[PDB]
Design an enzyme around this catalytic site. Structure first.
Site, PDB file in Angstrom:
ATOM      1  N   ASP B   8       0.851  -1.373  -0.073  1.00  0.00           N
ATOM      2  CA  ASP B   8       0.084  -0.065  -0.425  1.00  0.00           C
ATOM      3  C   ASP B   8       0.604   1.689  -0.042  1.00  0.00           C
ATOM      4  O   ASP B   8       0.115   2.582  -0.920  1.00  0.00           O
ATOM      5  CB  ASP B   8      -0.876   0.296   1.211  1.00  0.00           C
ATOM      6  N   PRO B   9       1.752   1.705   0.749  1.00  0.00           N
ATOM      7  CA  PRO B   9       3.129   2.717   0.804  1.00  0.00           C
ATOM      8  C   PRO B   9       3.555   3.006  -1.010  1.00  0.00           C
ATOM      9  O   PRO B   9       3.549   4.328  -1.228  1.00  0.00           O
ATOM     10  CB  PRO B   9       3.859   2.276   1.304  1.00  0.00           C
ATOM     11  N   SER B  10       3.266   1.828  -1.823  1.00  0.00           N
ATOM     12  CA  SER B  10       3.377   2.571  -3.051  1.00  0.00           C
ATOM     13  C   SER B  10       2.935   3.545  -3.720  1.00  0.00           C
ATOM     14  O   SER B  10       1.707   2.999  -3.803  1.00  0.00           O
ATOM     15  CB  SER B  10       3.946   0.879  -3.838  1.00  0.00           C
ATOM     16  N   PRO B  11       2.991   4.837  -4.175  1.00  0.00           N
ATOM     17  CA  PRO B  11       1.900   5.600  -5.188  1.00  0.00           C
ATOM     18  C   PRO B  11       1.922   4.523  -6.358  1.00  0.00           C
ATOM     19  O   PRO B  11      -0.032   4.479  -6.543  1.00  0.00           O
ATOM     20  CB  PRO B  11       2.402   6.427  -5.274  1.00  0.00           C
ATOM     21  N   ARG B  14      -1.812   2.357  -5.698  1.00  0.00           N
ATOM     22  CA  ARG B  14      -2.400   3.356  -4.915  1.00  0.00           C
ATOM     23  C   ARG B  14      -2.783   3.952  -6.119  1.00  0.00           C
ATOM     24  O   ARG B  14      -4.194   3.309  -5.882  1.00  0.00           O
ATOM     25  CB  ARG B  14      -2.090   4.130  -3.955  1.00  0.00           C
TER      26      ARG B  14
END
Ligand SMILES: N[C@@H](CCC(=O)N[C@@H](CS)C(=O)NCC(=O)O)C(=O)O
Ligand SMILES: N[C@@H](CCC(=O)N[C@@H](CS)C(=O)NCC(=O)O)C(=O)O
Lengths: 220, 218
Positions: B8-11, B14
């Protein structure tokens, strides 16, 4: 009447040149001298607020970014979709390769060096940067594992986009033929195109010369 | 049958999550944990030799790069073309904004700081990299001059792409609302979609927290 704004040391401008020649398209060319800050003029900002080259003008409409431009040109003018396949899975590969060029090759590999180089006379390049360029050559060699060209079995705008950056990045790191034979072969094949010299070769030579004249150091 | 590989932290993950939700497509989310180097296994390299996330799998066919995935999803699954207009001139704007995100925002802004940070523990950010981020905000402010969304008068995958980056860049450089009012309004127009938290907010926060725990300085 198509109008292309640019200057030939610029890789993305060269990619547009390649693509206009591949499509047998006539066009006007307007030089924008980045070294004299002509792209920072009030007039040019009205055309392109990102103040980059290339810009394409067609019947009043202004389009920028080489990859958008290239896709637009093929979509608009191509006799068929050879250079930019309509097939969605095929198109996804061409698109991926171009985003790869935009981010990894052009920003990450080239502009990452050239911006501080020509702006701030940063002539010392960390080895980890050169390592990243070589890593990207590896990725391109992987792309070519089972295909003649970057995005499949025929020439596409992915090849044009990628070759413009590759032929600039060699100013900093040569391509080792023994490591990257497919990438090497592929380049020679692009170099064979009748319009290659006029669209890419000329500008690539001038950029490579500008870089060499700066007398860089790779720092371990 | 759709499978998205990501964290989830990867733009760009997302961006794909935002698009999947917008199109209301069922998919399986397979976590590929970059911090555990799950993207460097032989198995993942077979799917994606670039060893990046996202990767999309559709009935066995593999495609990667968020921008290519997003265009593919809308083209293949969209009830209509609003998220990625077929009109060539309208598409050219969407395309340009996405290439801007890829190069200027993601690589030039974000990964430029996060690679040295996570790989070389470089917690000191040169002031000029923050300036460059702010300059990029300015470009976004210009893109919004005559339009409420990044690529025209309605929401497109250009918005999804750009929001993911912008929300990550905020971790390093606050957005000054007096300098970038249109960008600020735009970001609220996104933060409001019913699927925003599940697709972007969660991972944007996680990346912020990771960035904060590293105790940065300018
Ligand atoms: N993603 C853009 C990149 C364009 C770009 O950054 N061009 C450089 C020249 S190689 C430029 O205009 N630099 C001047 C500036 O950014 O102010 C494209 O593909 O056209
Ligand atoms: N252009 C790609 C960028 C993908 C990318 O760089 N993703 C990062 C995470 S935010 C990644 O996978 N990093 C691991 C690696 O590159 O080894 C996209 O839009 O999907």
């Amino acid at each position: 009447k198509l109008v292309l704004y640019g200057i030939d040391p610029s890789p993305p401008v060269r990619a547009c040149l390649l693509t206009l020649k591949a499509l047998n398209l006539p066009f006007e060319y307007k030089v924008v001298n980045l070294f004299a800050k002509e792209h920072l003029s009030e007039e040019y900002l009205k055309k392109n607020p990102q103040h980059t080259v290339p810009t394409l003008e067609e019947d009043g409409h202004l389009i920028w970014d080489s990859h958008a431009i290239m896709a637009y040109l093929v979509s608009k003018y191509g006799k068929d979709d050879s250079l930019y396949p309509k097939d969605l899975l095929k198109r996804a590969v061409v698109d991926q390769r171009m985003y790869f060029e935009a981010g990894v090759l052009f920003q990450g590999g080239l502009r990452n060096i050239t911006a501080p180089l020509f702006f701030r006379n940063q002539t010392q390049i960390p080895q980890h940067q050169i390592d990243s360029i070589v890593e990207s050559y590896g990725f391109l060699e992987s792309f070519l594992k089972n295909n003649k060209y970057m995005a499949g079995d025929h020439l596409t705008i992915a090849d044009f986009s990628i070759v413009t950056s590759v032929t600039s990045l060699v100013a900093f790191a040569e391509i080792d033929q023994s490591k990257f034979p497919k990438l090497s072969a592929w380049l020679k094949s692009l170099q064979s195109l009748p319009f290659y010299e006029e669209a890419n070769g000329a500008g690539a030579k001038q950029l490579v010369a500008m870089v060499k004249s700066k007398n860089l150091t790779i720092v371990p």
